[PDB]
């Protein structure tokens, strides 16, 4: 195109390795921040408990349920309940999951995020299905039942961002590095004898040219060219973590422009 540039080194179902050229440091960082916190996802945020004759306490279980990853593909077509006109929740603003489990076997019975069942009318949107990546296809060990042990619960999953609770976090950790050779002197390597021998060289060093001692420091040089890697939890596919990241940022910049337009009258 023309502005910031991309070079996707590695691409998987849960990881993007890329090079962000023609960008100011602020933008890369801001987009890193927004990926971490401001992207909407759907997570459990209400547990009605009918029976819990388990080892574990109601809220301990409830806590795990929020952390359980849920399909947030079509999340933009589900309202925040706070905006929904319904009294409480509904099919437009929420997804209802049910969990019934009883220790049938003598052997310890296990409870999985697969054992959760949607009851809500999904209205054809790719939403609320618990994220399974488990080879054996179970995904997340919620609880363990013994024998007479029963756990009957209902749960409403709502739209939210990691800023309100980390359970709505769509990404894991985000690798971020600029200037692998310290040509900018943006850091001061602590040493005993030799910085070069003592500090491990970066993977990204082969992506930039080495300094060359017979050259002075570059003063007009600026922070531009970033080696980022975005990891998904599985709520949203990797590309979307970065595309929705880019979007959500521009979305909230646009609101500022909009606010100036609004206060410009009365």
């Amino acid at each position: 195109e023309e502005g910031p540039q991309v070079k996707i080194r590695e691409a998987s179902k849960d990881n993007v390795d890329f090079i962000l050229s023609n960008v100011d440091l602020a933008m890369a960082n801001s987009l890193r921040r927004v990926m971490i916190a401001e992207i909407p996802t759907l997570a459990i945020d209400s547990v009605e408990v009918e029976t819990n004759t388990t080892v574990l306490a109601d809220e301990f279980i409830a806590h795990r349920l929020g952390l359980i990853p849920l399909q947030s593909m079509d999340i933009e077509q589900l309202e925040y309940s706070r905006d929904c006109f319904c009294e409480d929740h509904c099919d437009k603003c929420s997804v209802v999951l049910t969990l019934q489990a009883f220790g049938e076997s003598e052997s310890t019975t296990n409870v999985y995020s697969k054992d959760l069942v949607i009851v809500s009318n999904l209205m054809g949107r790719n939403i609320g299905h618990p994220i399974i990546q488990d080879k054996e296809g179970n995904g997340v060990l919620i609880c363990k039942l013994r024998k007479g042990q029963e756990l009957k619960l209902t749960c409403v999953a709502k739209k939210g961002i990691a800023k309100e609770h980390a359970k709505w976090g769509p990404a894991a950790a985000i690798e971020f590095e600029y200037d692998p050779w310290n040509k900018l002197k943006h850091t001061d390597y602590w040493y005993e004898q030799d910085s070069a021998k003592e500090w491990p060289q970066s993977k990204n060093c082969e992506y930039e040219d080495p300094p060359n001692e017979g050259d002075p420091f570059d003063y007009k040089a600026q922070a531009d060219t970033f080696y980022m890697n975005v990891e998904s939890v599985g709520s949203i596919p990797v590309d979307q973590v970065v595309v929705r990241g880019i979007d959500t940022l521009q979305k909230k910049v646009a609101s500022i422009l909009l606010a100036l337009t609004q206060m410009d009258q009365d």
Partner: protein
Amino acid sequence: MNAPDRFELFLLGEGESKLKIDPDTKAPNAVVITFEKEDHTLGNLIRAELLNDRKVLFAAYKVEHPFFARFKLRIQTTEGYDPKDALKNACNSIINKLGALKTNFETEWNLQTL
């Protein structure tokens, strides 16, 4: 127990406006916009972009206390240039930068495999 609600970080309060544009007393053609329910995500980005404009004499943001989600933005420009127009342009450029990044990332992603 004395902890505020987590939506207080992004949901606007009662009355509460997003931006408040106060005139700077200590300098001519300067202004202080208070952004309510915002952090270093917007703060840095806007300030950084303002510095790219050759008409912006001064630009800086600060978050007086971590507890509260709000930052102050001081902007001083040259004669015959409204800081509101400077902030407007700044935001506009930022969107166009992201607009490009969006299509660029997409273009690469579709050329990728796995």
